[PDB]
Amino acid sequence: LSQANVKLLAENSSYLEKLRKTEEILEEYERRFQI
Amino acid sequence: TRLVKLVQDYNYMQQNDKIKLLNHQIDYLNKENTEMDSILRSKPYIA
Known part of the structure; x- marks a missing residue:
């Protein structure tokens, strides 16, 4: 919880960030797909 | 004792500065x- 966290925390922010992007895209895509 | 300003000012002021x-x-x-x-x-x- 000295270095490992630091690395995992950095990764956490990234993993989240990736999800943040996909969530936004999905929201855009449902109402892009439409009819 | 009760009844040199320069030193009183030069430490105090140096003393003041140490503080x-x-x-x-x-x-x-x-x-x-x-x-x-x-x-x-x-x-x-x-x-």
């Missing part, structure tokens, strides 16, 4: 309990 320096040493040598209290919270979070 001001000490006030800064209190902050940098140090006041890091603020940050190390965060160590007291965070590092034990391994437990």
